[PDB]
Amino acid sequence: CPLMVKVLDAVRGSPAINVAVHVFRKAADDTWEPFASGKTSESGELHGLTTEEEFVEGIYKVEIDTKSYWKALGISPFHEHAEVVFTANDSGPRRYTIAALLSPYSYSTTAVVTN
Amino acid sequence: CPLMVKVLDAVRGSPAINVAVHVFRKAADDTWEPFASGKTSESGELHGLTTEEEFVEGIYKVEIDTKSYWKALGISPFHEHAEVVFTARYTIAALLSPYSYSTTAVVT
Amino acid sequence: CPLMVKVLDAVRGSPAINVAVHVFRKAADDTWEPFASGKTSESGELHGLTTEEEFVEGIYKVEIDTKSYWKALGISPFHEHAEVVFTANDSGPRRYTIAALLSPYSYSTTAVVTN
Amino acid sequence: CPLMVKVLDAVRGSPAINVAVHVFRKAADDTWEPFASGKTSESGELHGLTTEEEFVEGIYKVEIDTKSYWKALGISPFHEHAEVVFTARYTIAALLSPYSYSTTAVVT
Ligand SMILES: O=C(O)c1ccc(-c2cc(F)cc(F)c2)cc1
Numbered sequence A, C: 001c002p003l004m005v006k007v008l009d010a011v012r013g014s015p016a017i018n019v020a021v022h023v024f025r026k027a028a029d030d031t032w033e034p035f036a037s038g039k040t041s042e043s044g045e046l047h048g049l050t051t052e053e054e055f056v057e058g059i060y061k062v063e064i065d066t067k068s069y070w071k072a073l074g075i076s077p078f079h080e081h082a083e084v085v086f087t088a089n090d091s092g093p094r095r096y097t098i099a100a101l102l103s104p105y106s107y108s109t110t111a112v113v114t115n
Numbered sequence B, D: 001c002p003l004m005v006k007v008l009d010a011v012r013g014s015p016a017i018n019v020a021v022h023v024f025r026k027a028a029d030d031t032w033e034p035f036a037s038g039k040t041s042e043s044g045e046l047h048g049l050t051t052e053e054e055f056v057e058g059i060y061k062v063e064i065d066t067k068s069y070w071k072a073l074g075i076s077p078f079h080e081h082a083e084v085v086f087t088a089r090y091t092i093a094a095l096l097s098p099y100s101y102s103t104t105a106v107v108t
């Protein structure tokens, strides 16, 4: 249950559906290694990215493919993607929700971290 | 200027121009009385609302007519307007989308 | 299920718990009439404000008592409250989620409206 | 100026001052090469990053070191930094909180 991504659309007032998300974890040599990926559901949520055992301490990047999302609607957006980079699990296991709110020339993101 | 409003459009990536803004001060009977108003400029800014002399401590409401703004672009928006209510340099900034806005105060 | 409010805290990375919310509906004479109220739960959600039958077409104001929230933490915030004013159900019944993200000198809000 | 960055602090309601900002351009082999950098001023602004001559079409990354900013205020923040990636007047604005940020592009 440890990592979840939620994406909303501020233009349509809806979940952002079928948004591709890629998660990377920084490796020893400081390269970004592929960690997990998926697509948001009809409710704009992405679950089952990882397990408690696999989501170890480290620096993670969640890249939300906002450009493919807007291009799929028809709209030539500003950003290539929205990145969320963070250290995770560095004082033990936490549950992380990464939420993003998308517009063609703006996005926000926030984290909810619980124990 | 003691009070400035700045309005940006999050969809087009542009200042939000010609947006109506009305400011009210809270009266003793808890009603809102008109204080100042204007339209945003080509840079999405509204200055000249008040002077330091008039802008005393009080509760103020800044109402931004986001609904007319979006309608004129052909978009049905969600909010009737965007209201920012605070007690009192103040900059009230607003970033608009059809179903969302944000607002921040830069008090310098 | 027709009206829900979700509030997050951007300072703590947590749901905003025990935030008071008052909902008003504009009356014939253009006064704001009390409609519903409650407090956000431990997950920062507020459900059971109204029923499909009672939530008729109209203009509604959802006032989120952000100042009492921050004052309860210790922080003297900028805003008195966050207001969300909107016309509801004017092309039939919709389900409305009103979400807000709070910081002492800033908030955002977004609507998710589904059918 | 073709490119300006502006950074605001959503908690204190202030410009975010002395924030490090680094800009990278995407190279042909898909790597990020350094382009320009600076610290935000007392108004939370960074100008002088580039000239029109140098700022050609390309994919750019603006990295804002939000983590050092928050740490210096005694706050453990969530993000390592805030990255804004786009293809190319550009203003990149960022509004910061410890567990949240937003960003917008005002292209005028
Ligand atoms: O919370 C937001 O979405 C947000 C709100 C306002 C701004 C912003 C505020 C300013 F005063 C100037 C600017 F360029 C951008 C940037 C982001």
Ligand SMILES: O=C(O)c1ccc(-c2cc(F)cc(F)c2)cc1
Residues within 6 Å of the ligand: A006, A097, A099, A100, A101, A108, A109, A110, B100, B102, C006, C008, C097, C099, C100, C101, C108, C109, C110, D102
């Ligand atoms: O800063 C914002 O605009 C913003 C970003 C995300 C959310 C949000 C996050 C969630 F996990 C759920 C929700 F309903 C809304 C609400 C507002």
